[PDB]
């Protein structure tokens, strides 16, 4: 029945980890995301400033 | 008959790793870990503050407890003494110490 479409759908549901890797459930705060993006940005500006010809 | 008894008392694999019986990491892993710890230790011991530098931060006091007690006693004495001889707002006014009348008026 409809409870069979539901039973077949419930049986299929992935782990929380699986959603996490699929970027459906984030692994960090928007703040932490900001930290990371900032660090990346500064490292990048440094290496680019040093970048050889 | 003894076997089954010994089989009922079997630890979990985790519980064995807890006793440092089963390694939780490869030899190479333990080595890299040791090297890391070592470099950390080196760096920290390099910038290790001095005894005086750690005294001034109030981390560890030099004076014995009795010495401290003597300090906290002498201070209380001098304080009660100095506070029981505390001039009136008028004495300070008259001596140009207080410049405004509104200051400590309600005393």
């Amino acid at each position: 029945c409809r409870k069979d479409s539901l039973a077949i759908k419930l049986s299929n549901r992935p782990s929380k980890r699986e959603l996490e890797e699929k970027n459906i459930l984030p692994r960090q705060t928007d703040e932490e995301r900001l930290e990371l993006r900032q660090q990346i940005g500064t490292k990048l500006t440094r290496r680019l400033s040093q970048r050889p010809t | 008959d003894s076997l089954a008894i010994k089989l009922s008392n079997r630890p979990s694999k985790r519980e064995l790793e807890e006793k440092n019986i089963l390694p939780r990491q490869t030899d190479e892993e333990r080595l890299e870990l040791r090297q890391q710890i070592g470099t950390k230790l080196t760096r920290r011991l390099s910038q290790r503050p001095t005894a005086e530098e750690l005294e001034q931060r109030n981390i560890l006091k030099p004076r014995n407890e009795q010495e401290e007690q003597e300090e906290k006693r002498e201070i209380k004495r001098r304080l009660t003494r100095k506070l029981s001889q505390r001039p009136t707002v008028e004495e300070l006014r008259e001596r140009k110490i207080l410049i405004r009348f509104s200051d400590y008026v309600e005393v």
Binding site: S5, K9, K22, R33, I40, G41, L44, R47, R51 | -
Partner: protein, 357 residues
């Protein structure tokens, strides 16, 4: 505020510099009785649809101008003359092609500034690196691009015309062999969704085939829009297996691990260690669960026994190209890097080669 435009063979990703994710993502199609992207797909029944970008290279300039127009006006709702624009390009993009991109950006859309960055390079930047080897696998094309100090190494670049679209097609074929019929475009979209939701890369392919034949542990169920229910078994991992064994679709080409290794080997030996320790995966076709572990295993199998191997595959990687651009265009030191309208007026299409490298 600067704009970032990643021109995919399948999907255009567009947005504003400084943002963590693209504001608009839409299929790169042009429909004529003009409709672009989602609207074209909606009107797909009434009119035939054409792909302006095939295998990562722009081939139809009128349609591309249509796509960019839709991007600026319909999707982002901005005036192009008010924003510096960073565009992406494929590895080994021909000189004339990028020249035409620059010319169109300045003359047609009157942007105050623009820049053209290599997709794989942006992918590398998004992870905060300037040296490493990128596997960029999208909808239309797959690349291995080794990069040192921001410079792509052209002689060691590998191009493979096997990507996500091809995997979708293969999945349609094998599902059909199982007995479910998927010939129409709408059915194709359904199969693509099945691929994205249910497919994964087996760590050991033979063992996984044996497991799939031995039991129902791998079987999954998909409910069609008609409410019909279908069961998918080994197709889950046989589909993306094509990346490692292109012979599944009749290609003589080596798999992505072999092309990664070969690309690494074509580079100077001294930087090779740096390349092995920095494998960045980007693009939608790298989103399959288990692909990083399989790549680790294969690269480990090909490389020297003592070589350090590291695969970088963040969950956000499907859009990482764009993210890189988003970071790059928001850096203060990048502001000088832009090609200004005055400079373009002075040097013409030629300036992009000098300014961008």
């Amino acid at each position: 505020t600067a704009l970032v435009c990643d021109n995919g063979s399948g999907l255009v990703k567009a947005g504003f510099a400084g943002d963590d994710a693209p504001r608009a993502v839409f299929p790169s199609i042009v429909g004529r009785p003009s409709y672009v992207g989602d609207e074209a797909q909606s009107k797909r029944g009434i009119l035939t649809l054409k792909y302006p970008i095939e295998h990562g290279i722009i081939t139809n300039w009128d349609d591309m101008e249509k796509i960019w127009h839709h991007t600026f006006y319909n999707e982002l709702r901005v005036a192009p003359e008010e924003h510096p624009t960073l565009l992406t390009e494929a590895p080994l993009n021909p000189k004339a092609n990028r020249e035409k991109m620059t010319q169109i950006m300045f003359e047609t859309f009157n942007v105050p500034a623009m820049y053209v960055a290599i997709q794989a390079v942006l992918s590398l930047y998004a992870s905060g690196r300037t040296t490493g080897i990128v596997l960029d696998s999208g909808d239309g094309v797959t690349h291995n691009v080794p990069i040192y100090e921001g410079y792509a190494l052209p002689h060691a670049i590998m191009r493979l015309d096997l990507a996500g679209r091809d995997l979708t097609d293969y999945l349609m074929k094998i599902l059909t062999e199982r007995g479910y019929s998927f010939v129409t475009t709408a059915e194709r979209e359904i199969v693509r969704d099945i691929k994205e939701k249910l497919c994964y890369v087996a760590l050991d392919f033979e063992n996984e085939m044996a497991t799939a034949a031995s039991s129902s542990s791998l079987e999954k169920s998909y409910e069609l829009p008609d409410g019909q229910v279908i069961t998918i078994g080994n197709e889950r991992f046989r589909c993306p297996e094509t990346l490692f064994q292109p012979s599944f679709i009749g290609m003589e080409s080596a798999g992505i691990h072999e092309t990664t290794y070969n690309s690494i080997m074509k580079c100077d030996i001294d930087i090779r260690k740096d390349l092995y320790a920095n494998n960045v995966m980007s693009g939608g076709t790298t989103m399959y669960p288990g692909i990083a572990d399989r790549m680790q295993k294969e690269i480990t199998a090909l490389a020297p026994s003592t070589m350090k191997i590291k695969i970088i595959a963040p969950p956000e990687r499907k859009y990482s190209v764009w993210i890189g651009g988003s970071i790059l265009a928001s850096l203060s030191t990048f502001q000088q890097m832009w090609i200004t309208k005055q400079e373009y007026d002075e040097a013409g299409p030629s300036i992009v080669h000098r300014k961008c490298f």
